[PDB]
Amino acid sequence: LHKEPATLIKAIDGDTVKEMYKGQPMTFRLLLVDTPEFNEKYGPEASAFTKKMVENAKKIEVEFDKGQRTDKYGRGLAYIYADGKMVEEALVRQGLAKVAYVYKGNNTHEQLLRKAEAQAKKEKLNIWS
Numbered sequence: 001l002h003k004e005p006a007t008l009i010k011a012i013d014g015d016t017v018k019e020m021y022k023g024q025p026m027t028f029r030l031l032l033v034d035t036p037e038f039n040e041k042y043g044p045e046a047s048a049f050t051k052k053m054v055e056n057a058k059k060i061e062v063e064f065d066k067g068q069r070t071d072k073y074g075r076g077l078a079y080i081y082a083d084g085k086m087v088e089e090a091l092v093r094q095g096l097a098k099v100a101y102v103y104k105g106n107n108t109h110e111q112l113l114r115k116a117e118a119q120a121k122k123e124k125l126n127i128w129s
């Protein structure tokens with residue numbers, strides 16, 4: 001896989017971020033995780049965590065996997081990186097997202113994220129508490 005540039009337009013919630021990619025605006029949905037909706041327990045915390053991470057970053061990148069690049073709603077499906085740190089990993093490691101929506105052929109970083117989830121779960125962090 002390869003990283004490509006993008007720029008923040010707007011943090012939306014824990015696992016969706018509006019970004020300018022190839023010069024066009026689009027809502028990205030993070031591959032391989034599920035954050036709580038804003039109205040659910042840990043939702044505002046998840047939104048807050050993603051917001052800070054993307055807003056504070058000097059450099060945002062997107063990394064499509066080997067399969068589907070858009071979902072049925074027109075959202076882009078990618079891993080997102082903030083100054084080289086994967087957003088998914090950071091969220092999962094903090095117990096603010098679950099590994100989720102693991103579909104065949106768009107699952108390259110599954111085991112990395114599972115490892116992080118196991119460590120969050122061990123520490124009984126946030127969703128795991």
Ligand SMILES: Cc1cn([C@H]2C[C@H](OP(=O)(O)O)[C@@H](COP(=O)(O)O)O2)c(=O)[nH]c1=O
Pocket residue numbers: 029030031032033034071072077101103106
């Ligand atoms: C993460 C992801 C979600 N989706 C779709 C499945 C879910 O369909 P349904 O809306 O029909 O439940 C929806 C969940 O996204 P949200 O968690 O953003 O709601 O997004 C994909 O199709 N591919 C993906 O990689």
Ligand SMILES: [Ca+2]
Pocket residue numbers: 015034035036037
């Ligand atoms: Ca969600």
